[PDB]
């Protein structure tokens, strides 16, 4: 905001607070000087105290750019072999400032466009200037004359880089998602990488050739950083004329949109599943941040013989609104069941291969899958539709077995005991229904007051909890079959909640931007956090140690730990 | 990687040095004329004797080989070993050999060229050290035993894998395989570089230029399906068409006309792109046969344009240059030709340009319309422009003659345009 | 020739033998301080030793119909097969159809 921090290895080794209230906009270091330009066109130059020291510390001077000298400051650069010169490029022209004395030395001829980027070229005196039309100006500074002018039409230029490998290439990354490579000797365009980052999230926001390598690191705004190579030429004598196009090399990424549903994927607290509104299911890693693939939505070839009917334009699935995972049969058949927004069936997924499975699971009464659950043994998947029906599919062969018609509204929660003995469902008619499962009978039918919007089952104590619509959490023992606790105190809708790994707390995040920790034995709220941003998922670790939540804005997952 | 892979790269680095008598026998055994036994028998004095004789003959036929008689065919060039000199002298030696191959590309049906390049092959090792220019220069001769010998000698590059199938066999490589070889894309980048160097050194000839325009036409025909592969074939072939048109030889200009007409009937191009191509054609159009070919291709480009603003007027400078290169008697002979190639859109744009710009040759307009059967929308546009020109310019008897001609033929369309504008 | 001159830059005088970079920059084994213009000239030559100088600045400077029109048009545009015709014609052999 108003300060400049000087970190080494992550730790703030010095702070540099500026003497204004206007925010800092640009920042360029060179030599002993640090030049920080706050947004009202005034550049603060700080100096090293001792010429042996490691970072600038003391105030030195406060240059300023009035309106009659230039517009808003676009960038602050330094060129090589310029003693005490700071190249300040504004929206109208290019300036050179002597920083020790504090005296302007030169003002270029005003460009008839608006300048958006600057970049010092690896030759002497030359700076490249990207405008808001399609123009890259190669501008000299010893003379002050536009050496070259290269036109990209119908685009805004966002990031410029040069090559220093021994070839004279240029990379112009646009604000539309494109990245175009020029050869400056033949005045040619080698190539154009189309749509590497999303146009909707800024486009290409930085592109950098590494210093002497044929490797360009391009980062976008869609939570992704890539880097590409220039493979050497396939010819012998020609060489620089037959240039191979740039191929892919490494990259990291995440979610672009905020995440919708999270889930802890094993008991070690090693892996998280995270499905998000850009229709992507990722498998993040809580141990090492380079173990986190994206689960692949690449279908399997049918076992009947027909052809799978879809679009020939491949796409992603609809967004995920429920997930169930069970590690009991992993690496033998599928163990995730996911329920997508406004579709009439669920998908199986496989966490071993990190791929989709070969079965999809229908509801058979024209109803959307409103909730899903899996057996403990890993054999059965229960699909509760939006018309009451419970269909029970075998997961090895993905074949239908049963159907339970107790509800006539939607079924917002299913669970099975750890002994495969009893089975609870809860639905929007305010009804909890306790079925047997080894027989096929009904054991009981409880009716509460409000509708029921969520159910969480703790199998080690056989207690489940239902988030209602008179704004309360009803804790029901499943064996003796009655309400044992009724936690009151939320003031708006209850978004998400979960049990403690031992059965002692319920943590519930709700739409009044709060997260409350209720104690089950004594019955009262023992902790409350207020968040700046509403929390949409809360999941305890299967181990005791972590809490993982995720909010309305933000593309990540907040991790908390246990003082307890 | 693996030890065999790194050693493979080491071997291909030291591929040409004769570290032992067996490698020496093999390397000196590969030859263009003599077989294995006699090629392993003879020596550099023998080869250079034949070289100096054949180069005297080649300089007598075409007088540009005297410089190679000064440098590449001297006794110091008997003595010097290529594998010992530094990279700078290697580069200059490669420039000398590339210039020689560009000159003696056009003479390969000749035992003199065979003997001179025998000396180059068996002293400076061109057939493994720089085979790219060797194959590109002698690529148009592709049925001939000289190309068979070149193939049996050369270790083939990365890009010539089809010929890597055809190497050391009995049948020649076939035209479909040459179409494959050109149908790769990096090959086309390489070959257009070769032709740009060839034009800049000003030594092209009719056989090679025929061959390369035929391969280019077949490449466009093979990729007629993919709109995307055609769209990335655009800059290469239209850049070589630009350089081929900037050339001075009528042969190069006709070959560029051929590439232009086939590529613009295979891809529906932009209006500005078509007009820029027409501008370069007319701006360098000099000879008479090239004039005939250029009129044919301009008519074809203006026809294959199909879209919005299809038939609008030729702009100012383009119309000026076009009339200066084709005054009216030439286009009238072209129109009363009896082959009758379809050119109605170009004619209509021509008359609209005359109506806006010149405002004199309206009897010429009448003769054009008498010789051509235009279409209905073209007649409507001509009539509308003439109505505007009659309302602005002072009325003239030639304009009265034009409207009398319309009323004779197709008066009700004139009534419709007057109903749109006027009484 | 230049377009600006810096008086303090001619005024200044810098050491050399206090750092290893500038120790590379020295010329004689007896010189130990060098004024500003000779300093920046040596730095400029050292920059040339690191990054060699290219043709695209060494020779090129951007300063009757011509023959460069086709190259200029190809250099400007990036999509050749036009889509903004909207001709009320129909394109052959490639059908634009959607399922409903």
């Amino acid at each position: 905001e108003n300060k400049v921090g000087i970190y080494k290895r992550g730790i703030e080794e010095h702070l540099l607070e500026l003497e204004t209230d206007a925010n800092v906009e640009h920042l360029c270091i060179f030599g002993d000087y640090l030049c920080a330009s706050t947004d009202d066109n005034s550049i603060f130059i700080y100096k090293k105290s001792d010429p042996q020291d490691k970072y600038p510390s003391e105030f030195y001077t406060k240059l300023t750019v009035t309106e009659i000298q230039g517009g808003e400051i676009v960038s602050l650069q330094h060129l090589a072999t310029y003693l005490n010169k700071l190249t300040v490029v504004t929206k109208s022209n290019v300036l050179l400032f002597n920083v020790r004395t504090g005296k302007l030395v030169f003002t270029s001829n005003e460009f008839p466009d608006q300048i958006t980027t600057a970049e010092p070229a690896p030759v002497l005196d030359i700076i490249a200037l990207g405008t808001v039309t399609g123009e890259v100006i190669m501008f000299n500074m010893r003379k002050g004359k536009r050496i070259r002018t290269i036109k990209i039409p119908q685009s805004r230029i966002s990031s410029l880089s040069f090559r220093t490998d021994g070839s004279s290439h240029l990379s112009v990354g646009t604000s539309s998602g494109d990245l175009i490579f020029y050869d400056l000797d033949r005045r040619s365009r080698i190539h154009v990488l189309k749509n590497i980052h999303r146009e909707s999230y800024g486009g290409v926001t930085q592109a950098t050739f590494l210093n002497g390598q044929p490797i360009i690191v391009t980062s976008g705004g869609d939570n992704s950083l890539k880097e590409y190579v220039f493979d050497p030429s396939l010819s012998q004598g020609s060489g620089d004329v037959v240039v191979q196009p740039p191929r892919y090399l490494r990259s990291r990424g995440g979610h672009s949109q905020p995440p919708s549903y999270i889930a802890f994927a094993d008991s070690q607290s090693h892996f998280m599943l995270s499905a998000s509104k850009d229709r992507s299911l990722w498998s993040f890693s809580l141990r090492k941040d380079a173990q986190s693939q994206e689960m692949s939505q690449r279908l399997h070839k049918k076992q009947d013989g027909g052809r799978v009917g879809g679009s020939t334009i491949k796409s992603k699935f609809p967004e995920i609104v429920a997930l169930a995972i069970e590690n009991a049969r992993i690496g033998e058949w599928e163990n995730i069941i996911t329920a997508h927004k406004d579709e009439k069936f669920a998908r199986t997924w496989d966490m071993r291969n990190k791929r989709v499975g070969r079965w999809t699971f229908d509801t058979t009464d024209d109803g959307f899958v409103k909730s899903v659950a899996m057996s403990q043994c890993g054999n059965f998947g229960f699909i509760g539709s939006s018309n009451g029906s419970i269909t029970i599919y075998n997961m090895q062969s993905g074949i239908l077995r049963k159907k339970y018609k107790l509800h006539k509204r939607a079924v917002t929660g299913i669970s099975l005991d750890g002994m495969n003995r009893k089975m609870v469902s809860c639905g929007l008619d305010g009804i909890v229904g306790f079925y047997d499962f080894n027989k096929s009978t009904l054991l009981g039918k409880l009716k509460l007051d409000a509708p029921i919007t969520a159910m969480v089952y703790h199998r080690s104590s056989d207690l489940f909890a239902l988030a209602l619509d008179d704004l309360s959490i009803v804790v029901i023992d499943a064996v003796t079959q009655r309400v044992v606790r009724q936690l009151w105190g939320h003031s708006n809708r209850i978004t998400a909640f979960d049990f403690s790994p031992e059965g002692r707390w319920i943590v519930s995040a709700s739409l009044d931007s709060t997260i409350r920790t209720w104690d089950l034995p004594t019955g009262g709220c023992i902790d409350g956090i207020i968040v700046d941003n509403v929390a949409t998922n809360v999941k305890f670790s299967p181990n005791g140690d972590l809490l993982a939540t995720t909010h309305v804005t933000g593309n990540g997952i907040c991790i908390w730990t246990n003082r307890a | 990687s693996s030890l065999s892979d790194q050693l493979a790269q080491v071997a291909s680095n030291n591929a040409t040095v004769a570290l032992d008598r067996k490698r020496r026998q093999k390397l000196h055994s590969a030859s263009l004329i003599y077989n294995s036994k006699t090629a392993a028998t003879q020596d550099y004095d023998f080869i250079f004797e034949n070289a100096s004789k054949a180069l005297e003959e080649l300089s007598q036929i075409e007088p540009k080989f005297a410089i190679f008689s000064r440098t590449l065919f001297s006794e110091s060039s008997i003595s010097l070993d290529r594998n010992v000199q530094t990279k700078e002298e290697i580069k200059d030696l490669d420039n000398a050999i590339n210039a020689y191959l560009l000159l003696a590309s056009s003479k390969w049906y000749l035992a003199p060229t065979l003997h001179a390049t025998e000396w180059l092959v068996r002293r400076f090792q061109i057939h493994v050290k720089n085979t790219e220019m060797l194959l590109l220069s002698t690529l148009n001769y592709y049925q001939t035993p000289v190309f068979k010998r070149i193939l049996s000698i050369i270790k083939l590059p990365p890009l010539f894998n089809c010929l890597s199938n055809f190497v050391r066999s009995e049948k020649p490589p076939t035209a479909l395989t040459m179409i494959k070889l050109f149908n790769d894309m990096d090959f086309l980048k390489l070959y257009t570089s070769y032709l740009d160097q060839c034009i800049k050194h000003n030594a092209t000839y009719t056989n090679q230029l025929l061959f390369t325009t035929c391969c280019f036409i077949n490449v466009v025909a093979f990729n007629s399906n993919n709109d995307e592969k055609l769209n990335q074939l655009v800059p290469i072939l239209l850049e070589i068409s630009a350089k081929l048109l900037a050339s001075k030889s009528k042969d190069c200009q006709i070959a560029a006309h051929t590439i232009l007409v086939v590529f613009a009937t295979a891809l529906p191009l932009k209006k500005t792109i078509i007009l820029a191509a027409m501008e370069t054609i007319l701006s360098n159009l000099d000879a008479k046969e090239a004039k005939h070919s250029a009129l044919l291709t301009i008519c074809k480009l203006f026809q294959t344009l199909k879209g919005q603003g299809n038939v609008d007027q030729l702009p100012s400078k383009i119309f000026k240059l076009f009339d200066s290169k084709f005054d009216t008697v030439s286009i009238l002979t072209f129109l009363d030709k009896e082959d009758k190639p379809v050119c109605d859109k170009f004619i209509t744009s021509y008359t609209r340009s005359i109506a806006r710009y010149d405002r004199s040759k309206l009897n010429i307009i009448l003769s054009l319309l008498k010789k051509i059967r235009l279409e209905r929308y073209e007649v409507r546009l001509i009539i509308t422009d003439l109505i505007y020109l009659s309302e602005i310019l002072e009325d003239k008897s030639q304009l009265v003659e034009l409207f009398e001609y319309f009323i004779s033929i197709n008066e009700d369309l004139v009534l419709k345009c007057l109903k749109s504008l006027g009484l | 020739e230049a377009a600006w001159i810096d008086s303090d830059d001619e005024k200044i005088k810098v050491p050399i033998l206090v750092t290893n970079k500038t120790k590379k920059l020295r010329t004689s084994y007896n010189e130990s301080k060098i004024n500003g213009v000779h300093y920046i000239n040596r730095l400029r030559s050292q920059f040339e030793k690191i990054y060699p100088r290219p043709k695209w600045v060494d020779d090129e400077s951007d300063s009757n119909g011509d023959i460069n029109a086709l190259t200029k048009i190809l250099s400007t545009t990036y999509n050749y097969k036009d889509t903004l015709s909207n001709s009320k014609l129909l394109p052959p052999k490639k059908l634009d159809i959607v399922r409903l």
Partner: peptide
Amino acid sequence: PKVVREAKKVEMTEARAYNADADTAKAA
């Protein structure tokens, strides 16, 4: 056989750069 287009392992060679902390100098 078509042309074998096949990518080989890349290896970051050493770099050489510049130092603005020599480019800037103090007064007399």
